[PDB]
RNA sequence: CCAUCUAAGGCUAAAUACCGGCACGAGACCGAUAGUCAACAAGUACCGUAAGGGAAAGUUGAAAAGAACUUUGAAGAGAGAGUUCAAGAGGGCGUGAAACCGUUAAGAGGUAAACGGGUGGGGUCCGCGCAGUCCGCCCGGAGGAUUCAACCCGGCGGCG
RNA sequence: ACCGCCCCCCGGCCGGCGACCGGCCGCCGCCGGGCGCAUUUCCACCGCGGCGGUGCGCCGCGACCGGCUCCGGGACGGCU
RNA sequence: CUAACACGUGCGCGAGUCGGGGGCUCGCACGAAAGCCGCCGUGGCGCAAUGAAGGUGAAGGCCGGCGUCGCCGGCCGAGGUGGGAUCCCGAGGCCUUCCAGUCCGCCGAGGGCGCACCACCGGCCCGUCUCGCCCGCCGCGCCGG
RNA sequence: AGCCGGGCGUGGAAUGCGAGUGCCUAGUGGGCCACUUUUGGUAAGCAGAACUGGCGCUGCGGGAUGAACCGAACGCCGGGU
RNA sequence: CCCAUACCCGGCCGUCGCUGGCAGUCGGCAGAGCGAGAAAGAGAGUGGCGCGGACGCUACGCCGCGACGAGUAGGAGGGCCGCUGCGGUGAGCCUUGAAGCCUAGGGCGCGG
């Protein structure tokens, strides 16, 4: 008999991608080897992010990437994102960038290639920089999904700006009792 | 009941992707042989003959 | 790889004719058994008659 | 598929994952949205405030087509025309400005949100906003109304 | 290749279609390990068993 | 490539047989007849096979050539060796080693050859 | 002030619907307690004054070749004989389970029986057991081969 | 007319031909035929021969080594 | 089992996405499938919110021109603080006859640029309240900003 | 009070230990017992509370027997205590 | 002195943790290491005969160390557990005997 608790004995993190495609699994093999036979933690972070799910790999926009690479000090370094690089149409001037991503939108790829940059895939990234020196690791906005507007402190409760679940927006849908001081109460 | 959901719809891009993948895999001797087809005598598995 | 070799056209006699055609780009498409299986599964359900 | 569902793993457990004390009876709380004000009041108030009551005026024969008015923003404003148009206007030296008609592309009102690149534009629309107008004037350009 | 388009040419017979992009180009894992530029940046392989 | 088709075929081959908590591979040029990346005879560019001769005695050694990867008809070269066991094993060993031709299969090929040879010897 | 029609008379195919009817085609359906109630002399037998209610029930064999003839018995029913690949298919006859029963063999028996753990004893069968494994590399002895290495010719392959 | 993209021809580079080669030369290996002719090479048999590996048909015993335990017999010393 | 909704997961495309309805494919073993439409994206969902409604509808920061600037240009551009995986730099430091002297790679004080995300402070849009002044004109008004 | 910039690391009690955070969510909403405290009752294997631990959901050694007591909580085995 | 499923030592199964190790099978074209108290190079350079060497690695694999293992209601995972039909595949099986049924026979798996 030992006075211990087994509730949190097992950790929940992912050991391998839930996906079944073969290209991602080959990438996982390569980066598993790199992470376990290299002291650099960039490989560990990249492999962990390869394991993650789709909603945990949000797309990164061209405007975000250029904005985060225009910061001082990080010139002529390769921007690495484990998600999808999507094009942003509300930006005219695009510089030359050295991008690496699993997949890139067709229009975004056309824009970068026209601007003069080059697109890399995580394989060739391994060949170029195994330990990943000169890399700027970016990611898309994880809280960008609209489901996060429904989360948190419940609506109809003071100081809670949480979106309710309504089948249709209008004046006849959840506007009368809990939303007005004129009818009952106002939270 | 007869109104079970018998049919399914797939995206056109996904259908085209599947077709492309099948076509590309049909050109590899290892995969064709592993499918069971006897092609050890075939001169070239992307087999092309004239229009005659 | 991006290399597109040259594929010979075989005559009906079984021997190689003088003609040859470059390999179409489709055969270099990625192989995804995941997508192939998903599209098959879901499409081989659209030729199914109801029962009840 | 029935293969992967919870029922297959539940065979042999008398209870079927619904408890022994409180069984799986027909409708313990009433059908549908019953008791919204009586015994589900806490849930209704906590998760759907404003559900009960009336507010606003009644409009009988509503026609959405009268109020149809799609909008566009200035950051998207240059995407209505082709890129070659914009680059030609950019390297043009005569000072001529391209004409962008949002009604042709299916927008009625122009709202000014994004930053506008510094080149003259002739934006013709049906409705404008004050900030969009001042953005166009500041960048140099013209605002034209159509019916 | 007119049906499915090349890597740099869209499909002529279809409205707007192009071959799916490769997630990884060089899928020769044996090379990707056995290349000098990656082997250089590696620690020594510990391969001696330490039993209880 | 090679790893790609290995990932494709590791579980969906016609040569795969799985029973009695076992798994075996069937395609011809596969020493040890087991499902593995090393010994799979259809994936790699350089492949070694050892088969019994068509005649009741001898051993056929099959080597995959380097040029015609997509031409199955002219992809394998076969050599028949019909001698004593020691010289047969020596010839196979020289062929595997001094050619630098897939050296990881040297002992497997030698073991398979020795076996075929014994089988060929009349029973007691 | 504008806008738009001309009521209180009439006709008109096509696109649309179809668990009845005639004639067809098909199925990731059921396979005789299932599928229609109904695979069969089924809305039949049968029940109720009536409205109405409403079953059970498929399979010898390739071919009846369906057991001539003798014998005991009043007969049912048997013993021989015969057909058949098979009567270990004999007219509700393919296969033929369990519950339950008869008989034969073995074992046991005064705390109802049965059960878990641990042994012991006796059995039916199995090892096709009953002088005990094989495998290299040597050493020694008795043998026998068209015999090794090195060269020449030709072919093939790998690498540069 | 202009611009973008793509196909084809020619010219010049870069890279690959290990998802995609031909000729020449060199090295190596293999195979077929002669050369080779038995202190070489090979095949089969015998020894209760040796070394190494795996096991004994069944039933048993002993020895030493190590781990963990229970106990016994000696002797020495400190505060005392 | 069908429909709806929510969330988590896998795949395709991605500021877009989706032919489900229809049509073209010599209708018809499979095939009642599959392919195609692109000037068949009508349309749905998303890309803008807020107000009961009339309606309105999403940054700005520096210098020269009249600080006690009216007001035109030159610009620069979508905040700030704290914490932040990674990356950059790098004082110093990693050996053997000595000695001069390198190359390449690893270590590392401190110092940078700081992803996502959290907290906080500002800013902008719509309704509403308080205060107060100014500006525009085809119609100078119970006008508009 | 808010802002900037600068300087101070002997990380300022002991002991122990990775921590934070977000979604979706079943069952439950009849309880009972014991030391101590305690209300009603003559009292009760009665009725009602507070703290902690149990039983319920739990087998094992002991109390001959036993939901709650004493010891002790459990994978299949050998030895020792 | 006696003994519990408690405690100590040992074996075995499984779970969890180390988000541990292994692509280095680098071989006459070679040189067999990264267990060792001390953050980092068996660093590169310039001047004073016999042809030979086990296993491996279904990387969804294999291997090594520790700790732990009660369970109703309930939740989750893995089933090379099982039943029926469909698309593939086994140059599968079968009148020299399939399905089904019976068995004091030989076995496997913790179990289905
Ligand atoms: Mg325990
Ligand atoms: Mg848990
Ligand atoms: Mg349960
Ligand atoms: Mg309930
Ligand atoms: Mg219910
Ligand atoms: Mg009229
Ligand atoms: Mg009329
Ligand atoms: Mg009429
Ligand atoms: Mg049909
Ligand atoms: Mg039956
Ligand atoms: Mg019958
Ligand atoms: Mg019979
Ligand atoms: Mg019968
Ligand atoms: Mg008896
Ligand atoms: Mg209850
Ligand atoms: Mg009480
Ligand atoms: Mg408990
Ligand atoms: Mg207990
Ligand atoms: Mg007592
Ligand atoms: Mg014990
Ligand atoms: Mg132990
Ligand atoms: Mg348990
Ligand atoms: Mg029995």
Rounded to an integer, what distance in angstroms lies between the CA atom of residue C14 and that of residue A135? Answer: 55
Rounded to an integer, what distance in angstroms lies between the CA atom of residue D139 and that of residue D131? Answer: 12
Is the Cβ–Cβ distance between A34 and A48 less than 8 Å? no
Phi-psi region of A76 (alpha: psi -120 to 50; beta: other; left: phi over 0): left
Q: Which tokens go with D38?
A: 């009586």
Nearest by Cα to A56 from A148, A133, A134: A148
DSSP codes joined into one string, E1-52: -TTT--SSS--SSSSS--PPPPS-S---HHHHHSSHHHHTT-----------
Q: How many residues does chain D have?
A: 147
Rounded to an integer, what distance in angstroms lies between the CA atom of residue D27 and that of residue A103? Answer: 50
Rounded to an integer, what distance in angstroms lies between the CA atom of residue B47 and that of residue B32? Answer: 12
- Please count the other Cβ atoms lying within 10 Å of the Cβ belonging to residue D95: 8
Residues 6+ apart with CB under 8 A from D39: D29
Q: Which tokens go with F67?
A: 């040029």
Q: Which nucleotide is nearest to D17 (CA to C1')?
A: K74
Is the Cβ–Cβ distance between F108 and F31 less than 8 Å? yes
Q: What own/partner pairs with CB < 8 Å and gap ≥ 24 does A30-39 have? A: A30/A122, A30/A123, A30/A126, A30/E29, A30/E32, A30/E33, A31/A122, A31/A126, A33/E33, A34/A126, A34/A130, A34/E38, A37/E42, A37/E43, A37/E45, A38/A130, A38/A131, A38/E41, A38/E42, A38/E43, A39/A131, A39/E43
User: Distance of alpha carbon A23 from its chain centroid, rounded?
Assistant: 20
Which positions on chain I have an atom < 7 Å from some protein CB?
Answer: 1-3, 5-20, 30-38, 47-48, 50, 52-54, 56-59, 77-79, 85-89, 105-107, 112-118, 125, 145
Helix and strand element counts for chain D (H, E): 7, 6
Give bridge partners of residue F59 from the DSSP assignment: F52, F81
Is the Cβ–Cβ distance between C36 and C27 less than 8 Å? no
Query: Does an H or E element contain C16, and which?
Result: strand C16-22
C14 contact F CB<8A: no
> For helices F106-120 and F85-97, what crossing angle results, to 10°?
160
Is the Cβ–Cβ distance between D119 and D135 less than 8 Å? no
CA D117 to ligand 13 centroid distance, Å? 97
Method: cryo-EM
Asked if B34 lies within 8 A of F71 by C-beta distance, the reply is: no
Nearest by Cα to A95 from A80, A124, A75: A75
User: Distance of alpha carbon B12 from its chain centroid, rounded?
Assistant: 17
User: Resolution limit in angstroms?
Assistant: 2.8
Rounded to an integer, what distance in angstroms lies between the CA atom of residue F96 and that of residue A72? Answer: 58
Checking DSSP bridges between strand A78-81 and strand A98-100, what pairing results, if any?
A: parallel
Rounded to an integer, what distance in angstroms lies between the CA atom of residue F115 and that of residue F89? Answer: 11
CA D40 to ligand 15 centroid distance, Å? 19
Residues 6+ apart with CB under 8 A from D125: D101, D102, D103, D107, D108, D109, D110, D143, D144, D145, D146
Q: What are phi and psi of C6, to 5 degrees?
A: -110, 125
Residue F24 per-residue DSSP state: B
From residue D65, give the alpha-carbon distance in Å to each of A65, A172, C5, D27. 41, 20, 59, 44
Show residues of chain F in contact with E30, CB under 8 Å: 2-3
| Nucleic strand G under 7 Å from the C-beta of F100 | yes
Q: Which tokens go with A30?
A: 């390569």
| Nucleic strand G under 7 Å from the C-beta of C42 | no
- Please count the other Cβ atoms lying within 10 Å of the Cβ belonging to residue B31: 23
Rounded to an integer, what distance in angstroms lies between the CA atom of residue A183 and that of residue A171? Answer: 14
Checking DSSP bridges between strand C6-10 and strand A84-86, what pairing results, if any?
A: unpaired
Rounded to an integer, what distance in angstroms lies between the CA atom of residue C34 and that of residue C41? Answer: 11
CA A1 to ligand 20 centroid distance, Å? 16
Which positions on chain G have an atom < 7 Å from some protein CB?
Answer: 26-29, 137, 149, 156-159
Decide: residue D64, CB within 10 A, 0-12 exposed, 13-18 middle, 19+ buried: exposed
- Radius of gyration for chain F, computed over Cα atoms and rounded to the nearest angstrom: 15
Q: 3-state DSSP call for residue F48?
A: strand
- Please count the other Cβ atoms lying within 10 Å of the Cβ belonging to residue D144: 12
Rounded to an integer, what distance in angstroms lies between the CA atom of residue A110 and that of residue A132? Answer: 26
User: Distance of alpha carbon D17 from its chain centroid, rounded?
Assistant: 41
Q: Which tokens go with A115?
A: 């601007």
Tell me which chains share at least 3 CB pairs under 8 Å with chain B.
Answer: C, E, F
Q: Which tokens go with F64?
A: 């995959």
Q: What is the 3-state secondary structure (H, E, C) of chain A?
A: CCCCCCCCCCCCCCCCCCCCCHHHHHHHHHHHHHHHCCCCHHHHHHHHHHHCCCCCCCCEEHHHHHHHHCCCCCCCCEEEECCEEECCCCCCCCCCCEEECCEECHHHHHHHHHHCCEEECHHHHHHHCCCCCCEEEECCCHHHCHHHHCCCCCCCCCCCCCCCCCCCCCCCCCCCCCECCCCCCEC
Residue with tokens 């075996």: F24
Distance in Å from K3's C1' to A1's CA comes to 19
A99-A105-A109 Cα angle (round to 5): 50
> For helices C33-43 and B12-25, what crossing angle results, to 10°?
120
Strands (E) in chain F, as ranges, are: 48-52, 59-64, 76-81
Q: Which tokens go with D43?
A: 């849930």
| Nucleic strand J under 7 Å from the C-beta of D16 | no
User: Distance of alpha carbon D94 from its chain centroid, rounded?
Assistant: 41
Rounded to an integer, what distance in angstroms lies between the CA atom of residue E29 and that of residue F2? Answer: 8
Rounded to an integer, what distance in angstroms lies between the CA atom of residue F88 and that of residue A12? Answer: 57
């Amino acid at each position: 008999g030992v006075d211990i608790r087994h509730n949190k004995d097992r950790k929940v993190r992912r050991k391998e991608p839930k996906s079944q495609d073969i290209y991602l699994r080959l990438l996982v093999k390569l980066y598993r080897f790199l992470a376990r036979r290299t002291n650099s933690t960039f490989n560990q972070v990249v492999l962990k992010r390869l394991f993650m799910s789709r909603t945990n790999r949000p797309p990164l926009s061209l405007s975000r990437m250029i904005r985060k690479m225009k910061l001082p000090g990080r010139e002529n370094k390769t921007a690495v994102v484990v998600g999808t690089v999507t094009d942003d149409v509300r930006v005219q001037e695009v510089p030359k960038l050295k991008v690496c991503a699993l997949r890139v939108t067709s229009r975004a790829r056309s824009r970068i290639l026209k601007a003069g940059g080059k697109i890399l895939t995580f394989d060739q990234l391994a060949l170029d920089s195994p330990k990943g020196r000169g890399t700027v690791l970016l990611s898309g906005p994880r809280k960008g999904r609209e489901v996060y507007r429904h989360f948190g402190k419940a609506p109809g409760t003071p100081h809670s700006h949480t979106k309710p679940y309504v089948r249709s927006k209008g004046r006849k849908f959840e506007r009368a009792r809990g939303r007005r001081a004129s009818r009952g109460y106002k939270n | 009941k007869t109104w079970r959901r018998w049919h399914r719809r797939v995206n056109t891009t996904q259908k085209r992707y599947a077709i492309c993948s099948a076509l590309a895999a049909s050109a590899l001797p290892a995969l064709v042989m592993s499918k069971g087809h006897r092609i050890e005598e075939v001169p070239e598995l992307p087999l092309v003959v004239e229009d005659k | 790889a991006c290399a597109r070799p040259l594929i010979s056209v075989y005559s009906e006699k079984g021997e190689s004719s003088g003609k040859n055609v470059t390999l179409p780009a489709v055969f270099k498409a990625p192989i995804r058994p995941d997508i192939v299986n998903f599209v098959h599964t879901n499409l081989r359900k659209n030729n199914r008659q109801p029962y009840a | 598929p029935s293969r992967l569902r919870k029922t297959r793993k539940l065979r042999g457990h008398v209870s079927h994952g619904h408890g022994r004390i409180g069984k799986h009876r027909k409708h313990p709380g009433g059908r549908g949205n019953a008791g919204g004000m009586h015994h589900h009041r806490i849930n209704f108030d906590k998760y759907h405030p404003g559900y009960f009551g009336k507010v606003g005026m009644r409009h009988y024969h509503l026609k959405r087509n009268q109020s149809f008015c799609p909008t566009v923003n200035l950051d998207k404003l240059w995407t209505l025309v082709s890129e070659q148009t914009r680059v030609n206007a950019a390297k043009n030296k005569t000072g001529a400005a391209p004409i962008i008609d949002v009604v042709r592309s299916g927008y009625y009102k122009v709202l000014g949100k994004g930053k506008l690149p510094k080149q003259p534009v002739i934006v013709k629309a049906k409705f404008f906003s004050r900030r969009a107008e001042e953005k166009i004037k500041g960048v140099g350009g013209a605002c034209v109304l159509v019916a | 290749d007119d049906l499915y388009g090349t890597w740099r040419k869209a499909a002529s017979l279809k409205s707007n279609y192009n071959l799916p992009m490769h997630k990884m180009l060089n899928t020769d894992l044996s090379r990707i390990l056995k290349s000098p530029e990656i082997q250089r940046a590696l620690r020594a392989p510990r391969k001696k068993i330490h039993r209880r | 490539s090679a790893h790609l088709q290995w990932m494709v075929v590791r579980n969906c081959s016609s040569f795969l047989i799985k029973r009695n908590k076992q798994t075996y591979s069937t395609e011809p040029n596969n020493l040890k007849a087991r499902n593995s990346f090393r010994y799979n005879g259809l994936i790699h560019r350089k492949t070694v096979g050892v088969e019994p001769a068509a005649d009741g005695k001898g051993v056929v050694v099959v080597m995959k050539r380097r040029s015609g990867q997509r031409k199955p008809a002219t992809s394998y070269v076969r050599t028949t060796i019909n001698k004593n066991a020691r010289a047969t094993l020596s010839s196979i060993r020289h062929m595997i080693r001094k050619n630098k031709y897939h050296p990881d299969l040297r002992m497997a090929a030698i073991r398979r050859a020795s076996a075929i040879l014994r089988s060929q010897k009349p029973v007691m």
